[PDB]
Amino acid sequence: NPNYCFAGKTSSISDLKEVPRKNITLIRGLGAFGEVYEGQVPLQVAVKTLPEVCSEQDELDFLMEALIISKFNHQNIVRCIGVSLQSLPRFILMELMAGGDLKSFLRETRPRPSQPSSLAMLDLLHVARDIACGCQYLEENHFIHRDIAARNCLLTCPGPGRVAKIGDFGMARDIYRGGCAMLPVKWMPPEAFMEGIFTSKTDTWSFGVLLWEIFSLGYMPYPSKSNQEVLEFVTSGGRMDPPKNCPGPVYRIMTQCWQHQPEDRPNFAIILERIEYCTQDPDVINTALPIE
Ligand SMILES: C[C@@H](Oc1cc(-c2cnn(C3CCNCC3)c2)cnc1N)c1c(Cl)ccc(F)c1Cl
Numbered sequence: 476n477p478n479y480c481f482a483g484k485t486s487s488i489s490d491l492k493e494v495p496r497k498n499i500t501l502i503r504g505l506g507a508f509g510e511v512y513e514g515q516v517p518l519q520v521a522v523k524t525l526p527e528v529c530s531e532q533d534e535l536d537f538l539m540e541a542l543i544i545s546k547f548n549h550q551n552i553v554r555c556i557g558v559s560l561q562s563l564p565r566f567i568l569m570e571l572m573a574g575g576d577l578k579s580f581l582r583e584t585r586p587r588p589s590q591p592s593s594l595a596m597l598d599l600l601h602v603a604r605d606i607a608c609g610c611q612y613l614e615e616n617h618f619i620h621r622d623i624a625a626r627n628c629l630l631t632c633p634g635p636g637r638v639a640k641i642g643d644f645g646m647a648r649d650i651y652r653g654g655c656a657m658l659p660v661k662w663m664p665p666e667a668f669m670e671g672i673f674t675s676k677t678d679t680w681s682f683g684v685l686l687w688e689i690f691s692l693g694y695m696p697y698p699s700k701s702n703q704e705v706l707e708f709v710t711s712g713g714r715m716d717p718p719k720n721c722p723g724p725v726y727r728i729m730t731q732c733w734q735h736q737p738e739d740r741p742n743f744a745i746i747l748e749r750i751e752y753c754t755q756d757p758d759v760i761n762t763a764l765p766i767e
Pocket residue numbers: 505511521523553569570571572573574575576626627628629641642643
């Protein structure tokens with residue numbers, strides 16, 4: 476059984492909370508490798524499954540995922556309730572995030588003539604703050620996520636009291652121990668996709684892209700550009716334009732996250748400070764989002 480180290484503390488498969496399989500009931504499904512279900516332990520959970528038809532590396536990958544999420548402890552990182560590894564198919568049990576992933580949420584909850592006031596600027600700033608808080612936790616514990624993106628964040632509920640959390644750590648899992656075409660190039664800084672150099676400032680760049688995703692209400696970054704076109708564009712100093720109706724102060728946080736030199740990019744303490752200032756500024760939060 477592989478070991479995992481986080482914050483200088485080492486854990487093993489023996490440290491995972493094994494929940495008896497008889498206590499777990501699948502309720503309903505919720506494309507990638509494996510399925511996800513809503514389940515009950517009652518305690519409502521999301522259940523990630525490992526296909527019984529998998530390789531040894533798929534097994535090790537699944538195990539490492541369990542170890543990684545079980546060792547985080549922060550309000551903006553999805554909780555792991557436990558695992559069921561002693562029966563097949565193997566399960567990882569997670570906090571049920573009823574709002575689903577952030578990208579889907581943004582696309583489905585866009586303001587529309589039918590839902591004219593579904594979202595406001597403050598909703599978006601709160602999501603940004605939530606994920607930046609999770610990112611700050613990761614930074615201060617020296618963990619590099621490597622794929623901070625809307626598709627990897629989840630919401631606790633659809634409604635106004637929603638909290639956003641980081642939910643998928645597959646890329647970090649892969650690196651901890653795929654192909655070029657699967658690399659999240661549109662979320663990666665130049666030194667990452669060029670030299671394979673990752674630091675805390677890697678996630679700062681990606682967070683800038685997430686911010687663009689949030690304020691675009693769920694558009695794919697770099698509209699109309701392929702991965703290689705983005706690589707060349709960003710390497711040459713190109714950056715995305717502001718999302719439709721994006722307040723200047725918010726776009727300015729994006730452009731600071733996308734500084735070419737990692738040393739010139741803000742850490743997450745500074746990002747949080749700037750997001751908070753935006754939330755205080757009436758001219759920002761009184762700005763109307765586009766209606767489709
Ligand atoms: C592994 C899986 O986990 C969950 C998915 C979901 C989820 C996905 N979709 N939905 C919908 C269920 C029906 N109502 C709308 C949301 C809920 C909730 N909690 C989870 N822990 C997951 C998925 Cl599927 C996508 C992105 C993520 F970051 C994660 Cl971590």
